[PDB]
């Protein structure tokens, strides 16, 4: 079943290279959960990875040319142009936290099992499919707007086209995951991305630590802002 | 017979036994050596609580005879073995003849008799509330407290090659590697019975 | 009941989470008993701790706000951080309060109306009603511990356990909301965006009377 | 049955050598046991003293280039030269005596019967395939990761595949004990290897003394902590 299909994906992503397993992958158990449990986590990983990897290529797009949204928030601490590696490192300690916080909820919410199964799946590794972050039915609170489809333009779409996509998806993920490691090794090793040398600055800090040297702990908060 | 309890895995769920031993008598004899090594293994367990509470200065807020003038913190402030030689004359007395009492009891007044005829040995529950005091054990099963005692007997083998690496260590430097040298762990290495006799 | 404790947590917050004890309190039997009445004990002592922590948030609230009752011995005391103005009231007031609460609830204790206590089958943080038998206290009063108006009085059962769920929600954010101002109180730099609020102090927040012990060696 | 698998494993692994026993070790029965076990007992010294082998010319060649290692900050702070044999000899001795106990404790494990009879297999010298370990058994505190396959990218191989990995696994032990023999004498006695000559520096130690003159206490701890 797990094989199968990872199997019938690889010649879909690509038909000339197909199944391409070199490290065992396939069927290494992590925690004594079989082979399908173990497939479905690796499926999700890279689609998660490959979603997150697309937005950075974005989001350090968008940080390098500098597109500030606006005043009073965070946007007013950021200087007029320092690059990707420092634009997180001059946001507020609280702003990065809260952040942290507002994506670790965001996972909680897609890897939960009743939020999950209100949508009528389970979970990624125990037979469901991987990436289906379901939408918000029981929340408490009314909810606005889904998270996959925010304005719920893709209901009409047919589960053929939905696999296109997700082939798609998962291709132009490897590529931005490529294309931002390139970025990232062009930031801090010299030399490592031939087309990338001269066009991005040199950063000092670890890229692998997020509480690095603590930015302002200022609030920007005016109207009653008696918390301090 | 070598059947019992105490023979499990890491030893190749067989008898450890090099030497005779076990066979140099009958079945009274292991009844024997099973209850010296429970005997044995409790009053390790028991010597391991009482060095690990010595050693992190953790000592009664009392006095300790104000006659003779020595107290709790000063039995703390020297180091393990050299406490019991401190302890007056007339303590190590009422340990004593609290211990034997406790040794003839435990012998004695058995409603099946010693262990060696009649009776498991380890079992001074006839002494009521002696075991237990609070209930603790009062709804387990027998097949819970079998692997208990089982657990008891492998603690109590620990517990004695960790009271012997500690007289070692306290009497022959370098004997345990891990020991090696410590700031406590400082003294005779050893404690004879009313000090010096 | 190990049964209706997952009944009562479908409803708690849908089945998004349930029975969830990672320790398991719950299925013991603690002080030579049943389950079901350690169950019972377990559910009062969080009813009765969300009340405290509701009713303790609220005059934290109200205390380092400002508002404080002019009358007489109060006027005296003039600080702000809740935990100083308790160590420093006298200690006959701190006494009467603690055998106010003491009375409250050995009149909680009582079963002389209600028919079960709440180990043995009866509502858990139910305060029986002072006027149900009135020739069984020692001298008249009006005005119940619960609802001294008679303000819900005939009300849907429904409406009921849906406060009951209601009141064991808002306890227990009351309970993390009082902890968080309690550390507030001791450990800065701890529970973030109340950094800016709150006084330094010591004296060992859960001791009344003398002080001078405390966490220092943490 | 041991001497006819003793001779076909040795034609599998040099079919012009064969079987090449000038001592007759393979008729001796050294603990009155029968030749079953002598000849399993020899197999399993032959393959643990090839792998030990080989995984101390690995050591020898990164130990003798110089490496530090994830964090370090003690085991690659206190030497700059080592000359392969004065690498265990600046150690702290309690760092040794925990090796030395880490390795008994893995000796003692493979060994066990209880962790052979859970894996279904049985001991080297009592009808058993020399040389394999337990995975975990049950020791309540549960590994991460198996021993043998510690990624398990190893669990589809064929039989045939296991025999020739076996072979090779023995002849470059062997090859490997004849490299680090000469690595050790050339660090002694200066003309042995004649390949070698020069490479390697002179100890004035035993490698086969063990425990030598001990190196420092080395605290090595912080953090409050008030020993080693
Ligand atoms: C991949 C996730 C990701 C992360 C971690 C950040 C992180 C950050 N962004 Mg960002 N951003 C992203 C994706 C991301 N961005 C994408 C996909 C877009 C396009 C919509 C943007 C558009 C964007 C703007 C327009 C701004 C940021 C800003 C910031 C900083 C506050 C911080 C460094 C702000 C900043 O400091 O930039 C100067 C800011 O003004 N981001
Ligand atoms: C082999 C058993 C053994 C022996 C010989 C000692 C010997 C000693 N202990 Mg000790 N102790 C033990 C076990 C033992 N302990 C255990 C298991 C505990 C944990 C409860 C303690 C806790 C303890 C404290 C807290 C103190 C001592 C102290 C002492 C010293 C004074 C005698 C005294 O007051 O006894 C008291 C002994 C006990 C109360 C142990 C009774 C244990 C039995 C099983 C009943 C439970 C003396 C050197 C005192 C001292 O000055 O030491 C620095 C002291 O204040 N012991
Ligand atoms: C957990 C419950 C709790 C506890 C232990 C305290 C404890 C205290 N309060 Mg308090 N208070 C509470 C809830 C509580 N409050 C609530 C819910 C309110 C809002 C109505 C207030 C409003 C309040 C005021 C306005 C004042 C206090 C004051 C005080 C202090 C003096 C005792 C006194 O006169 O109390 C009187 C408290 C009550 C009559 C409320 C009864 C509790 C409700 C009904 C339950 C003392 C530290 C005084 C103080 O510190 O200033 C010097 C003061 O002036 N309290
Ligand atoms: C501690 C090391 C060690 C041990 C215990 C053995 C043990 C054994 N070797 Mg052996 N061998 C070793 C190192 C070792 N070898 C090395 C380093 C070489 C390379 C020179 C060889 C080359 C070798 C050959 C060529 C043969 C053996 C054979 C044998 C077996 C019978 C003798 C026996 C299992 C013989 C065998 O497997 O057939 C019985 C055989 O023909 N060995
Ligand atoms: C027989 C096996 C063996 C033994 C006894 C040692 C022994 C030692 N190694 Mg070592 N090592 C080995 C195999 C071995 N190594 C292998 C196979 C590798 C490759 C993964 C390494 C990689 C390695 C590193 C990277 C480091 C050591 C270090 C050390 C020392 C601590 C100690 C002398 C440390 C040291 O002190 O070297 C500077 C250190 O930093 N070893
Ligand atoms: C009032 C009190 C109320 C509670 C009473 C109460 O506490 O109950 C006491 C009690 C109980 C109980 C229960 O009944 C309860 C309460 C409820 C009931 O339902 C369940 C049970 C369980 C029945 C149990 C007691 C267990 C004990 C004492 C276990 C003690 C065990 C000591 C050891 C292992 C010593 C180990 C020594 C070591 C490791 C030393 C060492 C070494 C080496 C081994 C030498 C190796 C190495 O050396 C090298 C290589 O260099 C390192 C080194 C130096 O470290
Ligand atoms: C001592 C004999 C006890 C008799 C036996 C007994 O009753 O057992 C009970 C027992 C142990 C035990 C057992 C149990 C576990 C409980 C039960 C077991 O049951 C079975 C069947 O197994 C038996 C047994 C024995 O194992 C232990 C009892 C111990 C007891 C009763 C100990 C009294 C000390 C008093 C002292 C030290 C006074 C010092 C006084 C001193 C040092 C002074 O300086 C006085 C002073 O004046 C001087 C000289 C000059 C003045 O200017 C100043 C002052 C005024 C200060
Ligand atoms: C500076 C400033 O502010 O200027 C102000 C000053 C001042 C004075 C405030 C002003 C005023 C005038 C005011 C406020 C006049 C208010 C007078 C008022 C309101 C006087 C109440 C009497 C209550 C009685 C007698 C209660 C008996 C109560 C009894 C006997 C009981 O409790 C019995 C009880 O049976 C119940 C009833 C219920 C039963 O179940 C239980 C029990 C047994 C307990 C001004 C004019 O506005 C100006
Ligand atoms: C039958 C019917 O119709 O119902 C009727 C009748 C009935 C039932 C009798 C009624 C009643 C009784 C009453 C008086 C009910 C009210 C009860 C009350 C008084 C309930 C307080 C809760 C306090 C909370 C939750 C505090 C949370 C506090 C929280 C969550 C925190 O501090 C969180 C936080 O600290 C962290 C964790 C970290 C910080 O970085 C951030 C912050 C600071 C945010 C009603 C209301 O009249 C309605
Ligand atoms: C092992 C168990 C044990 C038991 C069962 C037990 C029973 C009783 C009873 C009966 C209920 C009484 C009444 C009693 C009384 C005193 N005990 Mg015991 N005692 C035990 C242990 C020790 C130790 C270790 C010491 C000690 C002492 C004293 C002193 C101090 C005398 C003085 O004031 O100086 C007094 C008055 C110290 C001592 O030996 O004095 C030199 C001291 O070191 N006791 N003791
Ligand atoms: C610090 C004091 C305090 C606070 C802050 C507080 C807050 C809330 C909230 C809002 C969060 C709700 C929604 C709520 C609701 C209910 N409360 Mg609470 N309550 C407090 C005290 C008591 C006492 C003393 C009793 C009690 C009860 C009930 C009943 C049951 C009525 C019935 O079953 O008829 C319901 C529905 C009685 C009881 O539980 O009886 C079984 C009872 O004795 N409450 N309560």
């Known amino acids: 079943s797990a094989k199968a299909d990872l199997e019938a994906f690889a010649k879909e992503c690509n038909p000339v290279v197909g199944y391409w397993d070199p490290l065992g992958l396939a069927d290494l158990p992590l925690w004594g959960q079989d082979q399908d449990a173990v497939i479905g986590w690796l499926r999700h990983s890279e689609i998660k990875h490959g979603r997150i990897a697309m937005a950075g290529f974005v989001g350090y797009i968008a940080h390098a040319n500098g597109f500030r949204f606006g005043g009073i928030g965070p946007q007013n601490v950021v200087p007029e142009g320092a690059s990707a590696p420092e634009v997180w490192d001059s946001i507020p300690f609280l702003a990065k936290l809260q952040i942290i916080g507002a994506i670790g909820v965001l996972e909680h919410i897609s890897e939960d099992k009743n939020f999950l199964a209100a949508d009528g799946m389970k979970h990624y590794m125990r037979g469901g499919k991987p990436g289906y972050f379901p939408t918000f039915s029981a929340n408490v609170h009314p909810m606005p707007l889904n998270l996959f489809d925010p304005f719920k333009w893709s209901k009409n779409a047919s589960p053929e086209k939905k696999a296109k996509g997700l082939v798609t998806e998962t291709n132009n993920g490897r590529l931005a995951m490529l294309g931002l490691f390139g970025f990232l090794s062009e930031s801090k090793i010299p030399g490592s991305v031939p087309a990338l040398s001269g066009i991005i600055p040199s950063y000092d800090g670890d890229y692998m630590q997020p509480f690095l040297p603590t930015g302002p702990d200022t609030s920007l908060w005016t109207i009653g802002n008696l918390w301090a | 017979v070598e059947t019992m309890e105490g023979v499990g895995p890491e030893t190749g769920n067989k008898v450890f036994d090099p030497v005779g031993f076990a066979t140099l008598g009958g079945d009274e004899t292991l009844a024997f050596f099973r209850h010296a090594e429970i005997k044995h293994g409790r009053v390790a367990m028991a010597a391991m609580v009482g060095f690990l509470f010595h050693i992190n200065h953790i000592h009664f807020p009392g006095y300790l005879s104000p006659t003779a003038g020595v107290t709790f913190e000063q039995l703390s402030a020297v180091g393990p073995f050299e406490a019991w030689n401190r302890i007056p004359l007339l303590g190590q007395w009422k340990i004593f003849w609290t211990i034997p009492g406790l040794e003839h009891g435990s012998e004695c007044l058995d409603p099946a008799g010693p262990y060696t005829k009649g009776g498991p040995p380890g079992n001074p529950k006839f002494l009521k509330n002696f075991w237990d005091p609070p209930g603790f054990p009062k709804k387990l099963i027998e097949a819970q407290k079998g692997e208990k005692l089982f657990s008891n007997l492998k603690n109590g083998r620990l517990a004695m090659i960790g009271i012997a690496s500690v007289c070692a260590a306290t009497a022959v430097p370098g004997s345990v590697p891990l020991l090696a040298n410590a700031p406590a762990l400082t003294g005779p290495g050893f404690a004879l019975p009313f000090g010096t006799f | 009941e190990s049964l209706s404790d997952l009944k009562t947590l479908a409803t708690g917050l849908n089945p998004v989470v349930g029975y969830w004890d990672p320790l398991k309190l719950g299925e013991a039997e603690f002080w030579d008993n049943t389950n079901e009445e350690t169950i019972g004990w377990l559910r009062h002592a969080e009813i009765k701790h969300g009340r405290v922590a509701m009713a303790g948030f609220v005059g934290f609230i109200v205390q380092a706000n400002g ?62 009603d002072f006027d149900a038998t009135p020739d069984q206290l020692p001298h008249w009063v009006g005005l119940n511990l619960y609802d001294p108006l008679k303000w819900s009085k005939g009300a849907s059962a429904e409406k009921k356990q849906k406060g009951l769920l209601t009141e064991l929600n808002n306890g227990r954010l009351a309970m993390l909301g009082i902890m968080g101002f309690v550390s507030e109180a001791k450990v800065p730099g701890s529970v973030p965006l109340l950094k800016g609020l709150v006084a330094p102090y010591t004296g060992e927040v859960m001791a009344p009377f003398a002080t001078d012990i405390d966490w220092s060696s943490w």
Not at chain 3, 97 to 110: K, P, Q, R, T
């Open chain 3, 67 to 128: 508002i404080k009752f002019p009358w007489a011995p109060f006027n005296a005391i003039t600080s702000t951080s809740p935990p100083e103005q308790w160590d420093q009231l006298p200690d006959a007031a701190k006494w009467q309060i603690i055998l106010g609460v003491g009375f409250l609830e050995w009149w909680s204790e009582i079963r002389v109306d209600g028919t079960p206590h709440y180990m043995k089958g009866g509502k858990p943080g139910y305060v029986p």
